[PDB]
């Protein structure tokens, strides 16, 4: 039956209305999609529901209706209300008002699962099997049930090629799948998924979606899912809400809401053609091998041949775990290759890289900037400090603020937004305002070669095309070389011109993005 | 309330020790090293990439209800779940601005959730990586607590705290992490704190003049400020020793009348 | 500025923006530039200052014709600026001097 209510809640952050007049109802089993712009308030609302600190309502309140064990300590779903429990006392029905009405909160908060945005909730040093095993032993099942469950879960998340692999040495989507597998294995009463697919390729995104459908809905658990990727919302839920700037613009069926959403998007810009000038990079037999005595050989890179050409946007598309991040880190002279040659052409000489030193790799590394897939800022600092003092801008401190504002505007922030964001901490931003801030941090030093590892992934089509036009304008007016690792195809068609396909550490072939697309399908 | 003194003595060394121990005393900053440069010298993580985690965030993991454990506000690095890293310093016996036990006492008096260890020629503090970088840049490297000549951020091979300075006034280094650039008069770190070379050397400023070192040092020396010139510290040390002896003999109010 | 030898010193304009006029530095005498005379309150107009070794641009001299409570005459914060002197009598020539031109000074104690 009815699971949780949400009254007229308005979350404010010092007369900055992040959310206002958000109201919805969910029952024992149903998927609801939360659809909105970037910075609309989806993550704030999800952390609001989860009960994280600092997300207490200012005006309204939310109610949780669930079963409860008044001695043995278990909440459960409101369906088990009226069932002789395994302990003695049975399942009393409790209408738990969140942020009030304690003595139930700790147990109830254990029975709610959240998929954090861009944050991986795993033990890192405890592999993949032990993470799921710990998740199972935390609550529910038992040391046969747990065992088979864990095997079938790693089947669903499709990680059988990384069973004993240390989860700290995993790669993006793999870590996200581990987190999802752990989050299922807790028998929750509600599943809050903040971008559960994340920046995953369509095949693995479909795989995760099937895993979600099989797992949660089959057990009649309610899900609150936010993607701001319309297709995922439409294919997963039946009811959906559409909120803009914290205001519910549309409440109704998922189909009608998502249809309303794709009407308010703007088409892509299709920048003019720009010629390239000379070859700039050259990679001959680059190979990265991760050899261990307990897990075998992990050939991340298997002899990739690449060649880049000055003013060019180069693309690296592929499936999750192909070796795109490893190749990008090898380009940025961050991760040395196990074998092969790598040459960079500063002006007319080719500095032999893979050799540390200022006479060597440090020569070209001054003009190389990389935005990592798992980026980070300095949370103890302000945005202005992050742009100016954290990296060392070559100008007096008085003229650094205007340079930072100009870079923020060029990233795609309005003048008012850039002015308001300067004296703010990264913890007060949203994932997708932080990503653009990191992009601005990379861009403000103006390097020659720029690597962007998944610039999109948490951004609207509007925000994504803003980033695209920013990259195109920078390339045109500053002859900046770009190497892009991405999964959004249309981004590659409209931005890149010589994308390449990566499959298991191989380059397969290189060509135009449309040619790569028709090779893929 | 109780207004805390921090150290006995009237000499400049005692005053400097009090300043280091005082959390409300703003240490004078003498250089500007960017956060990424400090991270590069530290050598634990590549700047620009996210912090590695040891456990899920504290909100994700489930703990039993503990009223006393929940009274203490955790660090942000703990709240996220970051690996505990270290930063190590070697201090010369020739008028280095900070000294091992002084460093450890100031760290435990000024910083939250730190693990400080003191050796004769070594001093290391361990904390969560993000907060560790924050207070390494803010306090440990940019302020008067660090002199690029007489002190050096160095792990692995530490030796030279008791040796004489070289021709440029720099502490002896068996690995030569930092070298003196005579063209600009600045000290440049050509290696990180454990010994692997850096791709681009980082400028950590120029050596502090010896006259300023005499004023900001925390060590007692015959050539500088001697302990005989500070009888107040010796009296307090002797009082502590006698109190320890009397307490270990018979811990009563009558035996402490001979204090 | 050369006042150690002659009675009239020369200051070269290095960078200019509205109210600020920064002078050239000598990367041979800017060694022991410890923070000496750091401002405590808002800097008044017509104050000559040199950035100490704290900031990256140590030794650059500058002066501004207005007053602000945050930045010194050289674009650095107060902890990175030490006040050396002030302009006493002649003014309204710092606003009509281009970059690279030399202005001449006379000490009046």
């Amino acid at each position: 039956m009815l699971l949780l209510e949400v009254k007229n809640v308005s979350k404010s952050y010092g007369d900055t209305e992040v959310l206002k007049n958000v109201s919805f109802e969910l029952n024992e089993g149903d998927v609801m999609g939360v659809l909105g712009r970037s910075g609309a308030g989806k993550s704030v609302l999800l952390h609001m529901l989860r009960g994280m600190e600092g997300y207490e309502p200012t005006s309204g309140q939310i109610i949780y209706h669930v079963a409860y064990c008044p001695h043995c300590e278990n909440v459960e779903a409101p369906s088990q209300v009226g069932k002789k429990c395994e302990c003695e006392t049975e399942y009393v029905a409790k209408s738990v008002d969140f942020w009030n009405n304690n003595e139930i909160t700790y147990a109830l908060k254990k029975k709610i699962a959240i998929m954090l945005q861009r944050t991986f909730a795993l033990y890192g040093e405890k592999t993949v099997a032990e993470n799921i095993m710990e998740a199972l032993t935390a609550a529910g099942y038992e040391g046969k049930d747990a065992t088979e469950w864990a095997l079938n879960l790693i089947k669903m998340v499709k990680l059988e090629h990384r069973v004993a692999h240390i989860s700290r040495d995993l790669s993006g989507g793999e870590k996200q799948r581990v987190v999802l597998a752990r989050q299922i294995a807790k028998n929750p009463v509600i599943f809050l998924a903040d971008e559960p697919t994340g920046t995953l390729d369509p095949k693995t995104a479909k795989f995760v979606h099937n895993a979600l459908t099989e797992a949660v809905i089959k057990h009649n658990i309610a899900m609150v899912i936010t993607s701001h990727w319309p297709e995922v919302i439409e294919e997963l839920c039946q009811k959906a809400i559409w909120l803009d700037k914290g205001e519910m613009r549309l409440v109704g069926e998922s189909k009608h809401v998502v249809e309303e959403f794709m009407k308010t998007v703007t088409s892509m810009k299709e920048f003019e053609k720009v010629e390239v000038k000379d070859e700039l990079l050259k990679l001959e037999n680059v190979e990265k091998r991760y050899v261990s005595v307990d897990r075998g050989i992990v050939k991340a890179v298997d002899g990739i041949d690449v060649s880049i050409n000055e003013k060019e946007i180069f693309g690296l598309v592929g499936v999750s775990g192909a070796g795109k991040t490893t190749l990008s880190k090898i380009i940025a002279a961050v991760i040395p290759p196990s074998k092969g040659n790598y040459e960079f052409r500063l002006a007319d000489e080719w500095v032999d890289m893979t050799k540390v030193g200022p006479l060597y790799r440090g020569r070209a590394k001054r003009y190389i900037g990389m935005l990592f897939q798992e980026y980070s800022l300095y949370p103890h600092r302000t945005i202005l400090y992050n742009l100016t003092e954290s990296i060392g801008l070559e100008m007096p401190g008085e003229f650094a603020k205007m340079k930072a504002e100009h870079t923020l505007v060029s990233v795609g922030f309005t003048e008012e937004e850039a002015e308001n964001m300067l004296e703010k901490h990264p913890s007060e931003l949203s994932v997708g305002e932080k990503h653009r801030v990191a992009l601005a941090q990379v861009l403000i030093r103006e390097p020659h070669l720029i690597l962007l590892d998944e610039p999109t992934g948490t951004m609207d089509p509007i925000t994504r095309n803003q980033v695209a036009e920013s990259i195109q304008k920078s390339r045109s007016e500053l002859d900046q070389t770009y190497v892009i690792v991405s999964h959004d195809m249309d981004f590659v068609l409209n931005v890149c011109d010589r994308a390449a396909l990566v499959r298991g550490g191989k380059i397969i072939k290189t060509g135009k993005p449309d040619e790569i697309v028709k090779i893929l399908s | 309330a109780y207004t805390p003194q921090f150290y006995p003595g009237a000499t400049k060394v005692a005053e400097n020790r009090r300043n280091h121990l005082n959390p409300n005393y703003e240490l004078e900053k003498l250089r500007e090293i960017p956060d990424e440069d400090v991270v590069k010298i530290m050598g634990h993580r590549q700047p620009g990439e996210d912090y590695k985690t040891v456990h899920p965030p504290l909100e994700e993991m489930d703990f039993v209800e503990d009223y006393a454990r929940d009274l203490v506000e955790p660090l942000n690095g703990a709240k996220e779940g970051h690996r505990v890293r270290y930063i190590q310093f070697a201090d010369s016996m020739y008028f280095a601005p900070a000294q091992p036990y002084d460093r450890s006492r100031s760290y435990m008096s000024r910083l939250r959730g730190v693990d400080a260890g003191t050796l004769s020629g070594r001093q290391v503090v361990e904390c969560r990586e993000s907060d560790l970088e924050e207070f390494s840049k803010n306090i440990l490297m940019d302020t008067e607590l660090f002199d690029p000549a007489t002190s050096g951020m160095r792990g692995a091979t530490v030796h030279g705290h008791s040796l004489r300075l070289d021709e440029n006034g720099m502490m002896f280094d068996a690995l030569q992490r930092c070298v003196f650039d005579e063209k600009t008069g600045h000290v440049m770190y050509v290696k990180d704190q454990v010994g692997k070379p850096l791709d681009a050397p980082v400028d950590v400023g120029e050596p502090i003049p010896e006259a300023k070192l005499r004023e900001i040092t925390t060590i007692y020396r015959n050539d500088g400020v001697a302990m005989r010139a500070d009888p107040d510290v010796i009296e307090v040390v002797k009082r502590i020793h006698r109190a320890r002896t009397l307490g270990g003999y018979i811990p009563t109010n009558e035996t402490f009348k001979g204090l | 500025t050369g006042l150690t030898t002659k009675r009239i010193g020369t200051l070269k304009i290095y960078f200019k923006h509205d109210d600020i006029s920064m002078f050239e530095r000598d990367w041979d005498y800017s060694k022991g530039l410890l923070p000496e005379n750091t401002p405590e309150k808002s800097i008044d107009s017509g104050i000559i200052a040199v950035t100490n070794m704290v900031k990256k641009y140590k030794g650059y001299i500058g002066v501004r014709t207005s007053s602000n409570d945050k930045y010194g005459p050289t674009g650095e914060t107060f902890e990175g600026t030490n006040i050396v002197g002030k302009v006493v009598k002649n003014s309204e020539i710092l606003k009509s001097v281009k970059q690279g031109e030399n202005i001449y000074i006379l000490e009046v104690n």
Binding site: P358, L359, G362, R363, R366, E394, M395, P396, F399, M402, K403, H406, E446 | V179, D181, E182, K183, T184, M188, V190, A200, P201, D203 | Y14, F15, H17, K56, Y57
Partner: peptide, 25 residues
Amino acid sequence: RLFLKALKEKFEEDPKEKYTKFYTF
């Protein structure tokens, strides 16, 4: 902007020029 370019040319501490001990010979 013209101002940004002016700052770029006026305040660019190029490592090779400042630290010839390391980046040169």
